[PDB]
Design a protein around this ligand. Structure first.
Ligand SMILES: C[C@H](O)CN(CCO)C[C@H](C)O
Ligand SMILES: C[C@H](O)CN(CCO)C[C@H](C)O
Lengths: 133, 133
């Protein structure tokens, strides 16, 4: 099947991805069929970046689980780039729905509790709640 | 462990492969389990072509190490087909990472410092740097 190479991460997985020149950026692992390109080379994954919805072929070694959040969240980039704040919103919103989390009720204002939730370890489910299905 | 038939090339090796009708094209030796197809016959190797990510079963005797770069790179085919230029880029990119090489930052644009690095024997690492792991 697809992505059967021993490396980590499968379709639907929420991940951080590192592209040369950019901060770790939130993404979702997708099948190559969604991309309109080609099958990924061995040991790579197609991902779709939150915020801009583009596709990149990325090594599985340049990906980590989104659940390792405080370790890869870049606070400077978050303060500097509106695009990164938009990216976090769509990424954490997808996380929230998967985990079955709800928050009370703007952009910054809506992000704040999702951000605290993520930074605090995705409680109560922990990272387990971020799995696909 | 598959491919233990005494012949050359193991999982992860960067190689040139020839299919009749075609120049030498860069590829990576993969396990049959990545292909979603049959196990490979004796003396054969599954390869995945850079550029289109498709799979082919190729005799281990019709494969050379990517390191023999200038001897098998085909300049006529390169200038003629963009597919080949794409294949070369992805192949050299994987080469670059394995090696730990770096190139200051378009397509043919990004290709120039890579192509020169390869044509001149992949210094400083030499071909020893293209090995898997
Ligand atoms: C605006 C920002 O560049 C978003 N990118 C997506 C590049 O296609 C993600 C980054 C390259 O990892
Ligand atoms: C021409 C094409 O884009 C590259 N092919 C791979 C297709 O099987 C490699 C060649 C057939 O050796």
């Amino acid at each position: 099947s697809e992505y059967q190479d021993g490396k980590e991460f499968g379709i639907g997985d929420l991940v951080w991805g590192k592209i040369k020149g950019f901060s770790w950026w939130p993404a979702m692992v997708v099948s190559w069929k969604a991309t309109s390109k080609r099958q990924a080379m061995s040991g790579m994954r197609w991902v779709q970046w939150f915020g801009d919805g583009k596709f990149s072929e990325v090594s599985a070694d340049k990906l980590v689980a989104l659940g390792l959040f405080s370790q890869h969240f870049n606070l400077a980039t978050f303060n500097k780039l509106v695009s990164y704040r938009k990216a976090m919103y769509h990424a954490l919103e997808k996380a929230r729905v998967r985990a079955g989390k709800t928050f009370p009720s703007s952009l910054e204002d809506q992000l704040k509790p999702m951000l605290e939730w993520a930074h605090g370890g995705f409680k109560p489910t922990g990272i387990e709640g971020l799995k696909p299905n």
